Amino acid sequence: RMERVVRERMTTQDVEAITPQTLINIRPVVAAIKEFFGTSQLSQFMDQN
Amino acid sequence: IFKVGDTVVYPHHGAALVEAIETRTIKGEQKEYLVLKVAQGDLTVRVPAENAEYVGVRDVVGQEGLDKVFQVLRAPHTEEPTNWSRRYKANLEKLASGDVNKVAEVVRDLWRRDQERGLSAGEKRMLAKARQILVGELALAESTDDAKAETILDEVLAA
Amino acid sequence: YATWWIRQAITRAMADQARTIRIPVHMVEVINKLGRIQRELLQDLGREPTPEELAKEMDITPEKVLEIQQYAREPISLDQTIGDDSQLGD
Amino acid sequence: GSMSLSFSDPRFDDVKAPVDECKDKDMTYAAPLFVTAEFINNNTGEIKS
RNA sequence: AGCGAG
Ligand SMILES: [Mg+2]
């Protein structure tokens, strides 16, 4: 997802005005990780009886 | 032209201290790749000396440009197109050009307008970025340091 | 010329016919602004900017940031299977 | 293909808070993730990392 | 999702 947004914005990126920090959007990655560790079925509530 | 330890100006990151130069042989060609480091983004940029000027890298400007920018800050009678979009595009292209005079004129005009009646957030962002780069460039222009550079900007805008 | 008109029409339609509880346009624009500003201050500060940062970057009182993010709370569906057999409705 | 972006050298920083404190104040037990990017303008010939 | 009775 981050790759796709990078490519999409790259067309509208002014050449020589862009750096990886301002070219990379981390939000999709953190969103995917957070939505996995919570509400993913294989990330189960620890069973401590 | 390019010497170690020189505080060279690279657009659009402003000041950029050189470290060294590397052979970095590519296509069998030891294309010289001089390395710059900018304190703002903490990133390293390696550029070829042969076309370094083509990109737009420039050395620290002397006092001639300093007095030029002061006089330009005292240049009245500025008018812009009626539409906000056209003037925004014009000043954005002016900033992108990297010319110190153009960005200085954009900064002063936008600041006087904002202080005149207050505008918006996008213009505020443009003004902040352009003023930041200008203050850094001036700080190194007289090695007067960023804080004192900000203060001298604040006194000279008063006119 | 037509690109700007089409952009305006699409953005206005997004503002109007996109949320079950219609937030009028000017509110929609200020919330979209808040979202973008917190995204950029997220790119810079790293941690989600606290209300103070947004209020400063938006020239409104911080309580206004609070209400701008309160109006923009999208509804949920009472027909969601809460399991991952029971819908939230019952 | 005028320019390209690359990633390298993933590296993790120290965890934000200790385990018990994370479990106590409801904050996730996570560590920052840093990756060295590298942007190369294939035509002009600049690398930015 | 895990879990109980049949
Ligand atoms: Mg039984």
PDB file of N, CA and C in Angstrom, chain C residues 7-29 31-32 75:
ATOM      1  N   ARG C   7     -12.707  18.613 -10.234  1.00  0.00           N
ATOM      2  CA  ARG C   7     -12.191  18.441  -8.881  1.00  0.00           C
ATOM      3  C   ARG C   7     -13.143  19.047  -7.862  1.00  0.00           C
ATOM      4  N   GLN C   8     -13.630  20.257  -8.141  1.00  0.00           N
ATOM      5  CA  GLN C   8     -14.533  20.919  -7.211  1.00  0.00           C
ATOM      6  C   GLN C   8     -15.822  20.129  -7.043  1.00  0.00           C
ATOM      7  N   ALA C   9     -16.392  19.645  -8.148  1.00  0.00           N
ATOM      8  CA  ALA C   9     -17.639  18.892  -8.065  1.00  0.00           C
ATOM      9  C   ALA C   9     -17.449  17.607  -7.269  1.00  0.00           C
ATOM     10  N   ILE C  10     -16.367  16.876  -7.546  1.00  0.00           N
ATOM     11  CA  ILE C  10     -16.124  15.627  -6.834  1.00  0.00           C
ATOM     12  C   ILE C  10     -15.905  15.893  -5.350  1.00  0.00           C
ATOM     13  N   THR C  11     -15.123  16.925  -5.020  1.00  0.00           N
ATOM     14  CA  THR C  11     -14.859  17.229  -3.617  1.00  0.00           C
ATOM     15  C   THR C  11     -16.132  17.654  -2.894  1.00  0.00           C
ATOM     16  N   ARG C  12     -16.971  18.461  -3.545  1.00  0.00           N
ATOM     17  CA  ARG C  12     -18.228  18.860  -2.926  1.00  0.00           C
ATOM     18  C   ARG C  12     -19.133  17.658  -2.697  1.00  0.00           C
ATOM     19  N   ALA C  13     -19.213  16.753  -3.676  1.00  0.00           N
ATOM     20  CA  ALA C  13     -20.024  15.554  -3.501  1.00  0.00           C
ATOM     21  C   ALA C  13     -19.494  14.697  -2.361  1.00  0.00           C
ATOM     22  N   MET C  14     -18.170  14.558  -2.266  1.00  0.00           N
ATOM     23  CA  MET C  14     -17.580  13.860  -1.130  1.00  0.00           C
ATOM     24  C   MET C  14     -17.982  14.521   0.178  1.00  0.00           C
ATOM     25  N   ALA C  15     -17.965  15.851   0.214  1.00  0.00           N
ATOM     26  CA  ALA C  15     -18.352  16.558   1.428  1.00  0.00           C
ATOM     27  C   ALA C  15     -19.802  16.270   1.793  1.00  0.00           C
ATOM     28  N   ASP C  16     -20.690  16.262   0.802  1.00  0.00           N
ATOM     29  CA  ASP C  16     -22.114  16.106   1.075  1.00  0.00           C
ATOM     30  C   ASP C  16     -22.533  14.649   1.230  1.00  0.00           C
ATOM     31  N   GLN C  17     -22.428  13.870   0.152  1.00  0.00           N
ATOM     32  CA  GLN C  17     -23.030  12.536   0.090  1.00  0.00           C
ATOM     33  C   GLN C  17     -22.019  11.428   0.396  1.00  0.00           C
ATOM     34  N   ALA C  18     -21.335  11.552   1.531  1.00  0.00           N
ATOM     35  CA  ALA C  18     -20.371  10.536   1.943  1.00  0.00           C
ATOM     36  C   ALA C  18     -20.523  10.079   3.380  1.00  0.00           C
ATOM     37  N   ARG C  19     -21.214  10.832   4.225  1.00  0.00           N
ATOM     38  CA  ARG C  19     -21.315  10.551   5.646  1.00  0.00           C
ATOM     39  C   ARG C  19     -22.783  10.449   6.033  1.00  0.00           C
ATOM     40  N   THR C  20     -23.115   9.418   6.816  1.00  0.00           N
ATOM     41  CA  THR C  20     -24.515   9.167   7.138  1.00  0.00           C
ATOM     42  C   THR C  20     -25.133  10.350   7.872  1.00  0.00           C
ATOM     43  N   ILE C  21     -24.360  11.006   8.728  1.00  0.00           N
ATOM     44  CA  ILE C  21     -24.768  12.239   9.390  1.00  0.00           C
ATOM     45  C   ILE C  21     -24.060  13.371   8.666  1.00  0.00           C
ATOM     46  N   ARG C  22     -24.812  14.145   7.887  1.00  0.00           N
ATOM     47  CA  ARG C  22     -24.205  15.125   6.992  1.00  0.00           C
ATOM     48  C   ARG C  22     -23.611  16.266   7.799  1.00  0.00           C
ATOM     49  N   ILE C  23     -22.298  16.429   7.700  1.00  0.00           N
ATOM     50  CA  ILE C  23     -21.616  17.606   8.224  1.00  0.00           C
ATOM     51  C   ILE C  23     -21.547  18.621   7.086  1.00  0.00           C
ATOM     52  N   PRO C  24     -22.093  19.845   7.238  1.00  0.00           N
ATOM     53  CA  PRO C  24     -22.047  20.810   6.125  1.00  0.00           C
ATOM     54  C   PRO C  24     -20.629  21.072   5.640  1.00  0.00           C
ATOM     55  N   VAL C  25     -20.498  21.735   4.487  1.00  0.00           N
ATOM     56  CA  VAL C  25     -19.221  21.739   3.770  1.00  0.00           C
ATOM     57  C   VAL C  25     -18.123  22.394   4.597  1.00  0.00           C
ATOM     58  N   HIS C  26     -18.380  23.584   5.148  1.00  0.00           N
ATOM     59  CA  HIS C  26     -17.298  24.334   5.776  1.00  0.00           C
ATOM     60  C   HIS C  26     -16.723  23.536   6.931  1.00  0.00           C
ATOM     61  N   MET C  27     -17.604  22.909   7.709  1.00  0.00           N
ATOM     62  CA  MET C  27     -17.147  21.978   8.722  1.00  0.00           C
ATOM     63  C   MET C  27     -16.347  20.847   8.085  1.00  0.00           C
ATOM     64  N   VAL C  28     -16.813  20.312   6.956  1.00  0.00           N
ATOM     65  CA  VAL C  28     -16.098  19.203   6.323  1.00  0.00           C
ATOM     66  C   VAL C  28     -14.677  19.621   5.969  1.00  0.00           C
ATOM     67  N   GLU C  29     -14.524  20.822   5.412  1.00  0.00           N
ATOM     68  CA  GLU C  29     -13.202  21.299   5.027  1.00  0.00           C
ATOM     69  C   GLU C  29     -12.312  21.495   6.243  1.00  0.00           C
ATOM     70  N   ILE C  31     -12.462  19.930   9.120  1.00  0.00           N
ATOM     71  CA  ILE C  31     -12.060  18.618   9.637  1.00  0.00           C
ATOM     72  C   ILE C  31     -11.036  17.958   8.726  1.00  0.00           C
ATOM     73  N   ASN C  32     -11.250  18.015   7.410  1.00  0.00           N
ATOM     74  CA  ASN C  32     -10.264  17.447   6.499  1.00  0.00           C
ATOM     75  C   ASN C  32      -8.915  18.123   6.692  1.00  0.00           C
ATOM     76  N   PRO C  75     -20.514   7.220  12.259  1.00  0.00           N
ATOM     77  CA  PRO C  75     -21.328   6.205  12.929  1.00  0.00           C
ATOM     78  C   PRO C  75     -20.775   4.807  12.714  1.00  0.00           C
TER      79      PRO C  75
END
